[PDB]
Amino acid sequence: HALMTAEELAFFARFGRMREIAAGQALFERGAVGTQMFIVVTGQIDLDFGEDLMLKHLGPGEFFGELGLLIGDHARSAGASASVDSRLIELAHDDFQRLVDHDPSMVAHFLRRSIVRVVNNEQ
Amino acid sequence: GLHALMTAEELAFFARFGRMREIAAGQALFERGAVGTQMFIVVTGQIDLDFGEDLMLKHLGPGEFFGELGLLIGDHARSAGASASVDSRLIELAHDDFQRLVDHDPSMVAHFLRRSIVRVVNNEQ
Ligand SMILES: Nc1nc2c(ncn2[C@@H]2O[C@@H]3COP(=O)(O)O[C@H]3[C@H]2O)c(=O)[nH]1
Ligand SMILES: Nc1nc2c(ncn2[C@@H]2O[C@@H]3COP(=O)(O)O[C@H]3[C@H]2O)c(=O)[nH]1
Numbered sequence: 001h002a003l004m005t006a007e008e009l010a011f012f013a014r015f016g017r018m019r020e021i022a023a024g025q026a027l028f029e030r031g032a033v034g035t036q037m038f039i040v041v042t043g044q045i046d047l048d049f050g051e052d053l054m055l056k057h058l059g060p061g062e063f064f065g066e067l068g069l070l071i072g073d074h075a076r077s078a079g080a081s082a083s084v085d086s087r088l089i090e091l092a093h094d095d096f097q098r099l100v101d102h103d104p105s106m107v108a109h110f111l112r113r114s115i116v117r118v119v120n121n122e123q
Numbered sequence: 124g125l126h127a128l129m130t131a132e133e134l135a136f137f138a139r140f141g142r143m144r145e146i147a148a149g150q151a152l153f154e155r156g157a158v159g160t161q162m163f164i165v166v167t168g169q170i171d172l173d174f175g176e177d178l179m180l181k182h183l184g185p186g187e188f189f190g191e192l193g194l195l196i197g198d199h200a201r202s203a204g205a206s207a208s209v210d211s212r213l214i215e216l217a218h219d220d221f222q223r224l225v226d227h228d229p230s231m232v233a234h235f236l237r238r239s240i241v242r243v244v245n246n247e248q
Contacts, residue, residue, distance in 0.1 A: 071241050104230035111236040116196050118240070 002062035002117060004039060008110060009061070009089070012039055015099045016091035027080040027088075034068035034076050036092045043086025047078040053123040057083070066114050069096055077122075125245055127187035129164055133235055134186065134214075137164055140224045141216035146207040155204040159193035160218045168211025172203040178248040182208070191239050194221055 004012065019038075021027060028034050030050050038045070040062050047056040047064065056078075058064060068074050069091065091099075100107045129137065144163075146152060153159055155175055163170070165187050172181040172189065181203070183189055193199050194216065216224075225232045 067240075067244060070237060071244055074244070100230070100233055104233045105225070108225055108229045108233040108236060111233060111240065112195060115192075115236065115240060115243070119192060119196055119199070119243070 002058065002064070004061055004063060004110075007106060009039065009041070011099065011103065011106065012091050013041075013089045015095045015102075016089050017095075019088045019090040021082045021086050021088065023082055023084045023086075025082050027082065028065075028076050030076050030079040032076045033073070034065065035072075036090055037063060037065035037069040037096075038080075038091070039063045039089040041087050041089060044083040045086060045088075046081055046083050048081070049078045049123050056123075067118070069093060070111075070114075125242070127183065127189070127242060129186055129188055129235075132231060134164065134166075136224065136228065136231060137216055138166075138214050140220045140227075141214050142220075144213045144215045146211050146213065148207055148209045148211075150207050152205040152207065152213075153190075153201055155201050157201045159190060159199070159201050162188060162190035162194040162216050162221075163205075164188045164214040164216070166212050166214060169208040170211060170213070171206050171208050173206070174203045174248045181248070192243070194218060195236075195239075 027038070027045065030048060040058050040060050042060060045058045045064065047058065049056075064080065065076075068076060152163070152170065155173060165183050165185050167185060170183045170187075170189065172183065174181070189205065190201075193201055
C-alpha cells in the first residue's frame with residue numbers, strides 16, 4: 001500500500017488543498033485527462049481499473065493519481081470514487097512544481113517510492 | 124520522443140559520481156532476470172536490450188540510460204538482457220553513488236526521476 005510519510009502529509013496538505021467528497025460520488029472516470037494527484041486522509045477511495053479486475057481500496061495516508069500529475073496527457077488508468085464520505089489532499093500540477101522548488105529532497109524521496117509502487121502494480 | 128537521453132548536466136554529474144566502463148562488441152553486461160543494483164548510461168556505441176519472448180530488441184545509443192529500475196527497486200529482477208552491439212563505453216552508477224547524488228543535488232535527481240517515470244509508464248515491450 002501507498003502511505004505517505006508524516007512530513008509528506010503535512011507538506012502536500014499545505015502546498016495543495018483539501019477536498020470533501022460524498023459517499024458514492026465519482027472523483028474522476030477511467031480514461032479521463034487529469035493532472036492532479038490525491039491523498040486520502042479520511043474515508044476510502046475505490047479504484048476501478050475496468051474489465052474484470054479487482055477493485056483497489058485506498059484508506060487514509062494512501063495516494064493516487066501521481067501518474068496524471070507527472071505525465072502530460074496521461075489518461076486515468078482507473079476510475080476513482082468515494083466508498084464513504086471522504087476527505088482528500090488535492091495536489092495540482094503547479095502546487096507540485098512549487099513543492100519541488102521549495103523542497104527537492106523530499107520530492108525526490110517521494111518520486112522514488114512512487115517508482116517502486118508503480119512497478120508493482122497494474123492489475 | 125520516447126528515447127532516454129540525459130541532460131548535459133546529468134551526463135556530467137552522473138559521470139563524476141559514477142564510473143566508466145568499457146565493454147567489447149558481443150559482450151553481455153547483464154542477463155535478463157538477474158539481480159542488479161546499478162544503472163547505466165551509454166556514452167559511446169550501442170547497447171541492445173533483449174526482453175525475451177518474441178519482442179523487438181531495443182537499441183540504446185549515446186546519452187541513453189537504462190537499468191534505473193534495478194537501481195531504484197530493491198530485489199528487482201532485470202527486465203531485459205543487456206549486451207554490447209559494438210564496442211561501447213558506459214557510465215556505471217552504483218546504488219551508493221546514486222544516494223550520494225541525491226544528497227548533493229536533490230533537485231537534479233528529482234527532475235531525472237520525473238523523466239524516468241514518464242519513460243517507464245510509456246514502456247514494457
Ligand atoms: N495503472 C495502474 N494504476 C494504479 C495501480 N494502482 C494504483 N494506481 C493508481 O490509480 C491511479 C488512477 O489515476 P492515474 O491514471 O492518474 O494514476 C493511477 C495510479 O496512481 C495499478 O496497479 N495500475
Ligand atoms: N520494463 C521495461 N524496461 C525497459 C523498457 N525499455 C527499456 N527498459 C530498461 O530496460 C532495463 C532492464 O534493466 P532494468 O529492468 O534494470 O531496468 C530496465 C530499464 O531501464 C521497457 O519497455 N520495459
